[PDB]
Design a protein around this nucleic acid. Structure first.
Ligand SMILES: CCN1C[C@H](C)n2c(c(O)c3c(=O)n(Cc4ccc(F)c(Cl)c4)nc(C(=O)NC)c32)C1=O
Ligand SMILES: CCN1C[C@H](C)n2c(c(O)c3c(=O)n(Cc4ccc(F)c(Cl)c4)nc(C(=O)NC)c32)C1=O
Ligand SMILES: [Mg+2]
Ligand SMILES: [Mg+2]
Ligand SMILES: [Mg+2]
Ligand SMILES: [Mg+2]
Ligand SMILES: [Mg+2]
Ligand SMILES: [Mg+2]
Ligand SMILES: [N+]
Ligand SMILES: [N+]
Ligand SMILES: [Zn+2]
Ligand SMILES: [Zn+2]
Lengths: 184, 368, 368, 184
DNA sequence: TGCGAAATTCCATGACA
DNA sequence: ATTGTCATGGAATTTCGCA
DNA sequence: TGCGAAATTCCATGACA
DNA sequence: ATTGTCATGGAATTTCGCA
């Protein structure tokens, strides 16, 4: 078996509904398997159409050999299958109710959710503008298991935005009580 | 004047008037018998006005002004007096063309790393497509990897929107651009400062300076053209395809594609290179660092035989950028303050401002 | 195809497939072990489609198409198959630039006599002056003597009016012009025929051909500019002054003014030459005939190292004159019928018309 | 004394009134002394203004050292004198009632009048358009006294319109009777 | 039969939409 | 069936003035 | 140790408003 | 305070296949 590489497998999934931001409600999350690199796309819905429109942007930069998802409707549609086939992408689904990625991807997806939650409290509506900085953070976050960030693994260089301040990522006592009050 | 010409008439020798010729009086005018015929020697105090009259007939240069004068007159060193006036004719100095080439181009070092330096520029207006009229082109200096963004205008606001999407991937140290309004606005400067990006501007009206992105513009238009042959020019939907197409095209001199230089491995595109299949990512990134440093670099070409080079304190003139009909193509003379490099200078302009300018938009003022 | 590849698998030798390499089967595909790695040998019947797919990614030329293919495949003489497709890609042929220079310019003989050949052209639109917008410029080929006429439009009717005033002095044998509408109209042809004048047209979009008058245009604008510095551009009243000014300016290479070449004596203008005061008119006209034949003539310069020269039957492409945005810069290929001279040709254009064209508006079609 | 030359002396004079042609009534006649070359200018009046406007055209081609005329008002005005002085032209007048030129000029002026008269009968109104051809005729007409036409003397070459048909220049019996009827 | 400087010639540069 | 040109000012070369 | 041809490299040309 | 670039296809040069 040949060693794992960038673009071998992209792991994709939706997050939301979220509080509306510039009319967007969901985030399409794409994580490269080997590097742990994350791309984020704001959508208006978890539809095949929004997925195709988003991935058309990503795949005009790099095309994965395999896309992996759970069995969301948007990913199991025959439209999404026609799209993947046109582009020579093999689609891969985890069995229903039982999502599998890899340790790396599972952890990264955990961070994304946790990092989003942290920033949407206080400004639940400004997350659209924050997407770029969330991505830089995620992508310049050191990997305990490998010695490198996703950036370094994808490009083979240090980044110009090193995030030396590995943050709490936990909710402070303020953020806890005013998050239980935002949905109350 | 009437002084000198007197001594001369009574056979005395005055310097500059060869003794071997016979100088006489006739019609109240000192004359001399020259091989070409008999010419009048005007008194020194008359000479400037004569040169000026000759010159002003058609604002002629050295030889054509001289030929008119030599028709009637002779005196020592006429061309020195001719050149003196040419150097003082504002209309000649600002209207005439240069006849001296710039020194040979610099070939700046390739940025060492992806994201060290971005080159950016607008293409357009193009024919409307989906109501878009321009393309923002962003080219990484090291890799040549390119990003394309359709805009309705070459504006700061559209540039900021596009760069926000791009900088989601990575932040560059420097962004280099020409001085189009979109890039020189304080809004855009704020945006750059906010993110630690240094803005670096080309000398004005010298797109060679943004040559990296300018050259990519050509390929972009060239591919768009080929794809649109025999169809209406609906280019908006093609931008993504072009981007991907160009980023994965080999440069024959380098033997690499910009995608390869950026990632060290092809993605799932057609005819993907498979040479590193058995290396680990780490071995792959190792070979990549090596490839990046051993890339071919062109060197400065031979100077033309009649190139000129800027020297501190020299009078030089800036090219008028967008000259109106029947108006001079050159600004008034100005002074070289600093020589930043053999192809770039700072000048003080008579107003007098400091301006950083390409030698290609300068000529040295003639006749000192 | 599947034929050839069979013999090859059972150790037989086929021409073009070096015997020293081991050719095997794997995944149902013939493979070979090349220094660069293991490549697939597609069957001949597959090869065209592979080349085409590689080429179409970005419509790449020889080497960049090859590099993509060599990633996956090997077969004998791939570049021959690559070049075959490049020669058949209509979009590449009509969009790509030439990389071959024209042969060195011709320096046609100076017309022998005043009035042998006139060169004519319009300058403008200029800023309105007295409601005039253009200048008709008429230059005698032998002398350089020039006539200027303000017009409201570059029209046949205005040209006819101006030439009627001019031809009051003398009738020229030939009038040479570019193919602007004013000069190609049948009204203008009638006018020329009526007076025994032969009309001679430049190849289209090649103002070098009208170089005599084009070069005078420059001096005309240059002098107008100098005179108008710091004033509004009221040029109408200046035309007469410019005409006289230029007709009496020395050409340093010739040592004569166009007026001198036309009349053999200066009129009553400033710094009039007096050298022939003691000759009779007859002696003067005698010296003049001599001057006219001994004028300096430039010779054709050295060819560039990568010039091309038109050959009967060769495929060549005409440059598109006024190409629209995102549209090809070259017409479809056409055939050289006659080579009028090394810089001019007649082509048959696919429509198919006969067109007389400058080599500067042609490139040879690549890849045969 | 130095030999005579083109541009040494231009002889000028008016002809008219004439039957209106394109609103013109007079012809300013200019003859070079030495070559016998003729320039013609249509004017609306024999005024200093019309003279200046016409000669401004001629003198943008060549400037005479001397202009000679009779004592017409247009030529004796101080405006016309200012004009000549500006241009370095010396003005010369014949004594009143006693016009002198030279044999050559007198003859040429005779031809001009005679050639005009011939062409204006039958079409007394089309002479404006005919001016160019009248000039070519006059200027390519052989000089019995010298061996050459004015064209040849001015340019030192043969012309492309040689007028080999030296015409009658006399009125035919038709032209005589229908010229006495035109002003009747 | 040779020197220093002035004169003339040479010629690349650039602009004619 | 048509086709580059030529003013410009530093440099290079030639000529001039004198011995 | 050298041949003929194929492969690769060289590089002037031209276009980025 | 900044700075030309690089796809292109014939030609030139080098390497390959075989002896
Ligand atoms: C208003 C700010 N501004 C200034 C000028 C207008 N400019 C700007 C551009 O992007 C370009 C441009 O692409 N090209 C094309 C070109 C021509 C020759 C070359 F060598 C290369 Cl490398 C490119 N030309 C110009 C120009 O200077 N024309 C006279 C230009 C620009 O944005
Ligand atoms: C419509 C008929 N027509 C065809 C074209 C438009 N054209 C006409 C002209 O008079 C000129 C002209 O003067 N120049 C300027 C120019 C440029 C380079 C040179 F070497 C020289 Cl000697 C002159 N260019 C063009 C032209 O071809 N531009 C692309 C031109 C003309 O009348
Ligand atoms: Mg899901
Ligand atoms: Mg720009
Ligand atoms: Mg540009
Ligand atoms: Mg024209
Ligand atoms: Mg023109
Ligand atoms: Mg009278
Ligand atoms: N550099
Ligand atoms: N010729
Ligand atoms: Zn001047
Ligand atoms: Zn193609």
């Amino acid at each position: 078996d040949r060693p794992q590489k960038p673009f071998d497998k992209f792991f994709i999934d939706y997050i939301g509904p979220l509080p509306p931001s510039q009319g967007y409600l969901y985030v399409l999350v794409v994580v490269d398997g080997m590097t742990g690199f994350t791309w984020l796309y704001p959508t208006k819905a978890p539809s095949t159409s929004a997925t195709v429109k988003s991935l058309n942007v990503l795949t005009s930069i790099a095309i994965p050999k395999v896309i992996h998802s759970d069995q969301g409707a948007a990913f199991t549609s025959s439209t999404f299958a026609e799209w993947a086939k046109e582009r020579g992408i093999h689609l891969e689904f985890s069995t229903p109710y039982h999502p599998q990625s890899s340790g790396k991807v599972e952890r990264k997806n955990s961070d994304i959710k946790r990092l989003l939650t942290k920033l949407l409290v206080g400004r639940p509506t400004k997350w659209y503008d924050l997407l770029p900085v969330v991505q830089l953070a995620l992508n310049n976050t050191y990997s305990p298991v490998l010695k490198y960030t996703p950036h370094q693994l994808l490009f083979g260089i240090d980044s110009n935005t090193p995030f030396a301040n590995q943050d709490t990522l936990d909710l402070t006592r303020e953020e806890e009580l005013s998050l239980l009050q935002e949905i109350r | 004047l009437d002084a000198e010409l007197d001594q001369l008439l009574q056979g005395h020798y005055i310097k500059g008037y060869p003794k071997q010729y016979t100088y006489f009086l006739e019609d109240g005018k000192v004359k001399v018998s020259r091989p070409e015929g008999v010419k009048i020697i005007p008194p020194q105090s008359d000479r400037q006005k004569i040169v000026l009259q000759a010159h002003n007939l058609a604002h002629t240069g050295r030889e054509a002004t001289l030929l008119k004068i030599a028709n009637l007159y002779w005196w020592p060193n006429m061309r020195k007096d001719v050149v003196k006036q040419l150097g003082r004719c504002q209309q000649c100095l600002i209207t005439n063309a240069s006849n001296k080439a710039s020194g040979p181009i610099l070939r700046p070092d390739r940025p060492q790393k992806p994201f060290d330096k971005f080159f950016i520029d607008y293409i357009g207006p193009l024919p409307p497509s989906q109501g878009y009229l321009y393309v923002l082109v962003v080219v990484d200096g090291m890799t040549g990897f390119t990003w394309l963004y359709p805009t309705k205008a070459p504006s700061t606001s559209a540039t900021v929107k596009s760069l926000n999407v791009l900088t989601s991937i990575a932040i560059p140290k420097v962004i280099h651009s020409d001085q189009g309004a979109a890039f020189t606005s304080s809004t855009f400067a704020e945006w750059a400062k906010e993110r630690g990006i240094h803005l670096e501007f080309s000398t004005p009206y010298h797109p060679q300076s943004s040559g990296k992105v300018e050259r990519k513009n050509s390929d972009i238009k060239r591919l768009l053209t080929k794809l649109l042959v025999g169809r209406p020019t609906k280019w908006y939907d093609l931008l993504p395809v072009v981007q991907l197409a160009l980023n994965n095209t080999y440069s024959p001199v380098l033997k690499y594609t910009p995608h390869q230089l950026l990632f060290g491995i092809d993605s799932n595109t057609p005819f993907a290179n498979q040479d590193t299949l058995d290396l680990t990512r780490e071995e792959e990134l190792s070979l990549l660092q090596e490839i990046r440093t051993s890339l071919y670099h062109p060197s400065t070409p031979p100077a033309s035989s009649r190139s000129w080079s800027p020297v501190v304190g020299q009078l030089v003139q800036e090219r008028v950028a967008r000259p109106a009909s029947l108006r001079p193509r050159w600004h008034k003379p100005s002074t070289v303050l600093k020589v930043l490099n053999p192809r770039t200078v700072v000048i003080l302009d008579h107003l007098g401002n400091n301006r950083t300018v390409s030698i290609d938009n300068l000529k040295p003022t003639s006749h000192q």
